[PDB]
Amino acid sequence: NEDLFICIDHVAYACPDADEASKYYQETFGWHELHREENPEQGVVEIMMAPAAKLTEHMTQVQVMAPLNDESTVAKWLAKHNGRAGLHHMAWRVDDIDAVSATLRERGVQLLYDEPKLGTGGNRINFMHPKSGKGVLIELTQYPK
């Protein structure tokens, strides 16, 4: 036994317009926008929001995701969900995605990628099958280095 997770890294929220949601989060909730990224290839725009201007070690953030094209994964997810914004998935932070992927694998855990893939920042990520998540899609994510 041992802890394979530091904390929930972020909760991904999918919506048709990331800008609109971020401005709502800021204007209405007073949340803080910490980072914005656009990935033409994935056809996804992502924005990181937090309840404070400065993150604390285990502070979980909210990730706003919106499509850049109707071919993107996010667009088809939104289509299959009343085209309405909704919680998309949970990402849990790991100190060593390889090491932890070994442990998870050893415990019969099924991942999505054979190998971790690069994501936001230099993050090395991977997921879990929506079934392996009892209905919920769960992402594994390790900060760079």
Added chain:
Amino acid sequence: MSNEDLFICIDHVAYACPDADEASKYYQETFGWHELHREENPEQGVVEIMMAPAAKLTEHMTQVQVMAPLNDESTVAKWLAKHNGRAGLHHMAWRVDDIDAVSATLRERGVQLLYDEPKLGTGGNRINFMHPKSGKGVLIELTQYPK
């Protein structure tokens, strides 16, 4: 009178599954998440389990709240049905220091709350929710620790 953060952190993410014990077994067995509290309320027909990634919680550490129907008349059973028997993220709860004040502020900005007055939650927390149209596609909970 500079505006101050209304939220401390995301208190917990609610996951609605048909079997809490089951889901809880999974988080501990497989994922190795620690179970910190289990509660059962007949009134509402719900069973809840608080899971954390560590044994001890850090000030701003978010937990996963496993919800599960105790019968088919529970609000949670319906939801599960609504989401086609598919378990899944149910809601997000944000911790606040003073729910009455945060609620008053939120209303001035046009937010709609489910209850006019805070309800009593688990552990003595005072809670309320921000109408889906307010949370924007998501049901957001406000949670104040009893103090």
